[PDB]
Amino acid sequence: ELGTSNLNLDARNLLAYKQTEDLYHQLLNYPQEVISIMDQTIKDCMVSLIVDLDEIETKFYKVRPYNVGSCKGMRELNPNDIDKLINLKGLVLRSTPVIPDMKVAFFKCNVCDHTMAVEIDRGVIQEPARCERIDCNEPNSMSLIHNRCSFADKQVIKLQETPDFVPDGQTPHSISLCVYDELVDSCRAGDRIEVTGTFRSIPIRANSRQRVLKSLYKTYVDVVHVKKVQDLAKIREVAAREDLYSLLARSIAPSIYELEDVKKGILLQLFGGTNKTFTKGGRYRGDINILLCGDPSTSKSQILQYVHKITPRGVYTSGGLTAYITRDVDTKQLVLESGALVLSDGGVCCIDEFDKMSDSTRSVLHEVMEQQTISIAKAGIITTLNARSSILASANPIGSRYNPNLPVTENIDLPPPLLS
């Protein structure tokens, strides 16, 4: 009734039955064939259960086994575990662009314009030595067409072991990954995922101009399943209370003693104002910016840490913050990279150690707080980027204490316009 095509399959409940554990062990030894025949079984189960048959013929069927066994680590992988299903957990580091894969080779008998479609197996193509049209029957008239074939999408992921597996300060390792179709782009950098797939080894080409192969093989895994690691009525019931303001304000800093007014101000800053774009006079800024000052005996960084995770969007940094073009490390190419402030659009950008701001970056803030737009003119690229972000910063006085007789200006060593 859904029209979906996916069948998750646990192993424990599969182990719960006494006849099935035989198929369980046979699946560990022979994953590919068992999975293929299970998919064909589901394909026939389509008709066995529906007895519209039209949606059935169009869709393929696959399974997603998981929880087959204990999660191993990259530090213990003996060659006894080749072509066997394993469960792995780790952190996704990098990715790669999707790589087309040859599936259906297209050919054309150029002299007689005759076209033939050829299937392939194990990558290697058995090219047709002669065009089937015995009327021409020429052997050498076989020419293929690159852009009229059919292709499969392949993506390669690089995976790092979790730091839990290195207790004595050693270095983690990397295991290459492969995915197909629905698993493409299912993960990206920085993710924490767990995967279940079979092992694999491949001969390395060595000299691409020669037939020799090295005595060692590269190790990589092929995975089939990946896991990671109307309430609006309730709002109005809460929103109808009279003391919502005070409880809501005090609810974001449970461990902070007193300091109620600053908490209320920070909460209102989090709520934000209104933004309008009337054309007769240009847009008006709707963001609130608040500064914190005082001796480093107030745990003021804790407030920024609270708001950073409380806010939907936000970047927490300290005194590089904006866009600058970089040279790619792993690849040799040029990409445009945006800084912390650009990513905080619509959210709250938190800044610490504001006094140690150097000098070049300060002007950038003067650029962004007065127009909410930053432009760049470098390496032939001229463009403007929108920021539209709120700012919350903390600074320290000069000396072991802040003298109340001393005015604020000198102790905070910021220019009068910026603080104004």
Partner: protein
């Protein structure tokens, strides 16, 4: 073609003697049949051979005038040929299994049974032995007392240096000594390659021993001996055989390097179950086979006679020392019973750390309290608290604070020592930056050197640049390091105790105010530290006399003199520190009022900190937090699962002693 020579050796008698030794040996019955039986049961996966048994057996059978030659000599002169002879002998005399086998698991044997029932049923090929062996063969070098037993010079051993190996030792069995520096990962290595030719009856097998090879394309089956092939053949991974492989290199020790020379290196190849039996940074005694390596892998066409050399491991003695993670045993239990009977411990431990440096008792007491750690394991609502203590040592040059720091680094297992400049890889970069030969850009991002539960010992804390200073501000209060350069965000869980020594920018104490003199350090960083202590050189007679007397008495005896009186020893301290950390007493509530009133009087002190002449009596909650941490450490170093008020008083007295050094 090739001229011939006459050699005294003949392998037939050697093989017969090998078989006779294996069958007849008496050291349970015969030992070697005892090994081979459990090998048959698929219980033992590798066979290790000792030549001491061979030597003693040959000598004791020499009592009857039948033997004519000896084996260990030819073993020493050449090794691989004897490995083949031993594998042949083992396969000839392989016993039957005396136990049942989980026979369904051996997928290779399933493939073999399929092939046999395919070909023999139609009327069969002799499979090569290497495709069937489940066992690895290893040799062990002899012992020198066994050589002393007899007159002959059957010595070997003699752990040569890296540079002591010449070109005349190729092919022999030799022993090296040194420190392991690099260890590669584990990768599969091919031994036998099996193809399949689309149902060609027998499937072709071939073996390769060289580090490179070429594949097959057309099989020799009769249906493919026909003018065209019965289906193209492909390489089959499941049927082929593989062995665990790894590569490591060793470097000469400094002691063995002649003056005015640079240490050299030597590569080692390891195979079989012995893989992963050694880790970088340890002294080992490796016995192996010194084999040549062809240069054609470089493919330069030069070096017509020049070739590279390597060693193949056979038996590794890890040597060095085992940390053992304070694993309990009867001896350590009676040792801790002796420690309990010792009564008062901390003073003896302080006396026993660095007797070379005279005096400075309270510094050693603070070192004791730093080694145990403060209150940890969080509080309610998940709020972060660390047991690590940050103490900074301050004083004049020539006070041997660096030497005491070196002693602490020696006495602690997790200690890391750093000082002013000399290299750029100390911080902000992982040790694996651009390390692999493939240059895979292996990195973690923001991390330090073993910062997880490490002891960061720093000398010249006023010397490093802004980058290391930023790193050490970021390691503050168990905060992780999350510096990113290329999208990496795998932060290192920085939880370490900070102990650093810094010198005044004037090189001497000053009559004017100290906080302005300071260390040229941020006041925030200064307030972060839990304890600040001073070492001021006071010219006096009654102290310089004792110091000079102790130093000269140390010089005269060339040892640690009996002048020292320490009941406890460095290994004993290393045991007891782990023991005390294991106990981990919990906090007692009743100290709340006492510590609150103590902090009240400390804020009363802050009411007097504008009097100046020293302005370290500041107001900071971190002062109270460090007080609580030090009281918890005092409760942890001994006593039951409670916290004593005397611990709080001792912590306050320690703080007072730290403060009074200003004057």
């Amino acid at each position: 073609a090739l001229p011939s020579i006459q050699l005294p050796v003949d392998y037939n008698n050697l093989f017969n003697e090998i078989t006779d030794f294996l069958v007849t040996f008496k050291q349970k019955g015969p030992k070697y049949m005892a090994m081979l039986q459990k090998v048959a049961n698929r219980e033992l996966n590798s066979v290790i051979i000792d030549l001491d048994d061979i030597l003693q057996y040959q000598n004791e059978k020499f009592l009857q005038g039948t033997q004519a030659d000896d084996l260990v000599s030819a073993i020493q002169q050449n090794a691989n040929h004897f490995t083949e002879l031993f594998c042949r002998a083992i396969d000839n005399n392989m016993p039957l299994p005396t136990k049942e086998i989980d026979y369904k698991d051996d997928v290779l044997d399933v493939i073999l049974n399929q092939r046999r029932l395919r070909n023999e049923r139609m009327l069969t090929e002799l499979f090569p032995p290497n495709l069937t062996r489940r066992y690895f063969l290893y040799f062990k070098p002899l012992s020198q007392n066994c050589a002393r037993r007899y007159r002959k010079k059957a010595i070997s051993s003699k752990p040569l240096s890296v540079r002591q190996i010449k070109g005349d030792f190729l092919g022999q069995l030799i022993t090296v000594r040194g420190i392991i520096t690099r260890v590669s990962d584990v990768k599969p290595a091919v031994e036998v390659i099996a193809y399949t030719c689309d149902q060609c009856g027998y499937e072709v097998f071939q073996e390769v021993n060289s580090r490179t090879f070429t594949p097959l394309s057309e099989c020799t089956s009769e249906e493919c001996s026909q003018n065209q092939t019965k289906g193209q053949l492909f390489m089959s991974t499941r049927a082929s055989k593989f062995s665990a492989f790894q590569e490591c290199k060793i470097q000469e020790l400094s002691q063995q390097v002649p003056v005015g020379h640079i240490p050299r290196s030597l590569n080692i190849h390891v195979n079989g179950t012995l893989v992963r039996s050694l880790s970088p940074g340890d002294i080992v005694d490796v016995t192996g086979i010194f084999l040549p390596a062809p240069y054609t892998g470089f493919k330069a066409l030069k070096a017509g006679l020049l070739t590279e050399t390597y060693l193949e491991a056979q038996f590794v003695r890890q040597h060095k020392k085992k940390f053992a993670s304070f694993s309990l045993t009867s001896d350590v239990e009676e040792r801790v019973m002796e420690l309990i009977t010792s009564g008062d411990v901390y003073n003896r431990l302080a006396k026993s750390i660095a007797p070379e440096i005279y005096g400075n008792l309270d510094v050693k007491k603070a070192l004791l309290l730093l080694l145990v750690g403060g209150v940890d394991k969080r509080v309610g609502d998940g709020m972060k608290i660390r047991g690590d203590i940050n103490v900074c040592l301050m004083g004049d040059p020539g006070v041997a604070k660096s030497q005491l720091l070196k002693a602490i680094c020696k006495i602690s297992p997790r200690g890391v020592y750093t000082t002013g400049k000399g290299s750029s890889g100390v911080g902000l970069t992982a040790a694996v930056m651009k390390d692999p030969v493939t240059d895979e850009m292996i990195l973690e991002g923001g991390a330090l050197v073993l910062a997880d539960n490490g002891i960061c010992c720093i000398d010249e804390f006023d010397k490093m640049d802004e980058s290391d200073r930023t790193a050490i501000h970021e390691v503050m209060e168990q905060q992780t390091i999350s510096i990113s350069k290329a999208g990496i965000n795998t932060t290192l869980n920085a939880r370490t105790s900070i102990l650093a020594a810094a010198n005044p920018l004037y090189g001497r104490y000053n009559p004017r105010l100290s906080p302005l003199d300071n260390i040229n350090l941020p006041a925030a960083l200064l307030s972060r530290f839990d304890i600040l202590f001073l070492m001021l050189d006071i010219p006096s007679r009654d102290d310089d006399e004792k110091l000079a007397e102790h130093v000269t008495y140390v010089h005269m005896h060339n040892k640690q003199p009996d002048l020292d009186f320490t009941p406890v020893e460095p290994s004993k301290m290393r045991e007891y520190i782990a023991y005390a950390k294991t106990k981990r007493p919990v906090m007692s509530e009743a100290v709340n009022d006492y510590v609150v009133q103590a902090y009240i009087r400390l804020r009363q002190d802050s009411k007097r900190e504008m009097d100046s002449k020293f302005s370290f009596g500041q107001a900071t909650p971190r002062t109270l937090l460090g007080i609580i941490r030090l009281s918890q450490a005092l409760a942890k170093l001994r006593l039951a699962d409670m916290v004593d008020i005397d611990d709080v008083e001792e912590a306050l007295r320690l703080v007072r002693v730290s403060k009074e050094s200003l004057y």
